[PDB]
Design a binder for this molecule. Structure first.
Ligand SMILES: CCCCCCCCCCO
Length: 157
């Protein structure tokens, strides 16, 4: 079965555990390019009562660096917020819990904004069919495929 974090049947406990960044997308491409602050490689999600603890690593000059973030539930069900290079809010528009998770995030910094979308997998890669479904979700948010970056061949340290 599939669910959205904003949906009535969402079961947040089921997204707990191991995840990997498979594809990142943004309407401001530089944010997810080589030295972008949003080129984050997810490692795990720890589900807590009113928050999610996210563990990631970033890469630079071929060197991995760990970083953790705590995302808090907001007043709208299925939405979380976290401070990181500005103020962010995000939801999970589609996940099947066992294979993939698609997240949509809005960043606000210095009076500006941009959208980020991420495709995460339980394994270090996903099927071409799931990757195509992600491209379609990106299209629905006005993000061109040329702004979608597959990082499956570079998500391990
Ligand atoms: C539901 C947990 C998935 C992570 C939320 C998206 C955060 C994007 C990090 C910058 O690429």
């Amino acid at each position: 079965e599939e669910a959205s974090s904003t949906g009535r049947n969402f079961n947040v406990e089921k997204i707990n555990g191991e995840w990997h960044t498979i594809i990142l997308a943004s309407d401001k491409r530089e944010k997810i390019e080589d030295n972008g602050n949003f080129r984050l490689f997810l490692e795990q999600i720890h589900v807590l009562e009113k928050s999610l603890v996210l563990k990631f690593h970033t890469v630079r000059d071929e060197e991995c660096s760990e970083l953790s973030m705590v995302a808090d539930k907001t007043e709208k069900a299925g939405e979380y917020s976290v401070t990181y290079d500005g103020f962010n809010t995000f939801t999970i528009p589609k996940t099947d819990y066992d294979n993939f998770l698609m997240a949509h995030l809005i960043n606000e910094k210095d009076g500006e904004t941009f959208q980020l979308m991420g495709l995460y997998g339980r394994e270090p890669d996903l099927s071409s069919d799931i990757k195509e479904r992600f491209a379609q979700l990106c299209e629905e948010h006005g993000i061109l495929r040329e702004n979608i970056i597959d990082l499956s061949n570079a998500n391990r340290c």
